[PDB]
Ligand binder design. Structure first.
Ligand code: NA
Ligand code: NA
Lengths: 295, 295
């Protein structure tokens, strides 16, 4: 059987202030912990990516769930997607409002409907039918995200390979500050925000959503693995192309079908954590990687 | 400079009546002739594909715009996308209601916003701001589609090469009958419903939306072409993969950057037309195609 693994990311960002880096560090550790605990007890790859991303959705420090960036009207509209590498089954939602966990709604879509993608009002109606609670929009809005919008005017992901050799990705976001109402980015679109395939691996992406969509970044990365590039070579070429062709920045996490993994980015930073062989691997800036024991 | 070509499809289907067959025929002719007419003036591939699809949207015989299938609530919800292969510029709309031409709105997303994808309420607000008429909902509902919805309760596209060497695709659809509220197919999702890249070619797809999304059909087709496979080989490989892996049948059209083109499908039938060099090709069933001179 396969030694399991989970990689998590807290999105592409520019420079991060001293004190924020600590709470971001705290957030990543817990997310990878939730995911690795699931894998260490024979939970599936899908269960693991879902668990890790709920933690980041629940933590107001991250642009997904509580703490999502606000649209051009000071409201939170969220996108999410999840994918099962075994049969390529998938679920996704876009521009969802007044719910706590977008990623959980995407897994409902995957397992419970005959569809792969629901949006906006239809996503709300399915949620309520699934008994997903309705939370006031203000429970998702932070004070820092109010400040960010008022100044602009004037993502999170996980991959996992489980003990059976199944792979999975999940991605969840509030989008991009000052976005038009109903703007949908890459995060709920398979092949762009993420892709999972047992015969190759699983990728989750972050960064400029419009660019990620244009180059199909997640699927693109896996293409290169199929050519015989390493996970790191594949990440370099795909992000390189998004930079060269459309002038877009971001980052990605990937795991191969055989357990190889990397976190690479072309923006300044990308908080990432990994857990494989009882250890925790963490970083934010290039080559700041710390390795700790994860009992 | 290249000889322009426009290829159009009127969506995969099971067996079709001989009467409707001819009604579909003339509409395919209408669309391809509009798109070719656009290229004849030396117009862009984006202009041509938008023209071909608008014509199919207005046509009641095809499942896009007027004549879109009904969702569970007896309503019309539409998806469309458009991509410019030169710079990968793209525009898409999902779950749009009560407007004539979703493909026209997708282009407005592409050329009049920094976003690539709008959905539901946000797209409809953007439709108001661009002065798009909010027409009556019942006008898109056809009697034929009501019967199909009662029974279940008991896609169109175009690729072009222009004389400047540019490629584009446009796809539009009402989705599938009795679909859940806010269900999103492949049609508006870049890499699935279509892809256009001046350095490879362009593709527009049709068939079971969830299957097309899961395997990213349009982009997979183009991966084979990059790998040196012929347009037909490539379409047969991607369709072949979709059938075995996720048990979905579909169809596509593809035009390479060197002007080579094909329509292939694994559904029972796919009405299609291609206009090139003063000849209009047309088929619905495999093998039998009529070629006639174009004035
Ligand atoms: Na959060
Ligand atoms: Na129509």
């Amino acid at each position: 059987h396969m030694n399991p693994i989970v990689v998590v990311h807290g999105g592409g960002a520019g420079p991060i202030s001293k004190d924020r880096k600590e709470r971001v560090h705290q957030g990543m550790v817990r997310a990878a912990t939730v995911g690795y605990g699931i894998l260490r007890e024979g939970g599936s790859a899908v269960d693991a990516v879902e668990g890790a991303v709920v933690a980041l959705e629940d933590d107001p420090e991250f642009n997904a769930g509580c703490g999502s960036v606000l649209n051009t009207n000071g409201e939170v509209e969220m996108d999410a997607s999840i994918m099962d590498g075994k049969d390529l089954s998938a679920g996704a939602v876009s521009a969802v409002q007044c719910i706590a966990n977008p990623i959980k709604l995407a897994r409902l879509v995957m397992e419970k409907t005959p569809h792969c993608f629901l949006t906006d009002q239809g996503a709300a109606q399915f949620a309520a039918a699934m008994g997903v609670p309705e939370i006031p929009g203000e429970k998702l809005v932070t004070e820092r995200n109010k400040k960010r919008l008022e100044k602009e005017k004037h993502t999170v992901g996980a991959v996992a390979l489980d003990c059976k050799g199944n792979v999975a990705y999940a991605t969840s976001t509030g989008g991009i500050v000052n976005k038009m109402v109903g703007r949908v980015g890459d995060s709920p679109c398979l092949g762009a925000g993420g892709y999972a395939d047992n015969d190759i691996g699983a990728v989750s992406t972050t960064g400029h959503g419009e660019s990620i969509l244009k180059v199909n970044l997640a699927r693109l990365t896996l293409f290169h693995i199929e050519q015989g590039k390493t996970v790191e070579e594949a990440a370099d070429l795909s992000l390189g192309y998004m930079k060269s062709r459309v002038k877009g920045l971001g980052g990605l996490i990937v795991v191969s079908k055989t357990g190889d993994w990397v976190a690479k980015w072309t923006s300044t930073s990308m908080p990432w954590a990994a857990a494989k062989d009882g250890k925790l691997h963490f970083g934010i800036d290039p080559d700041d990687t710390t390795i700790t024991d994860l009992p």
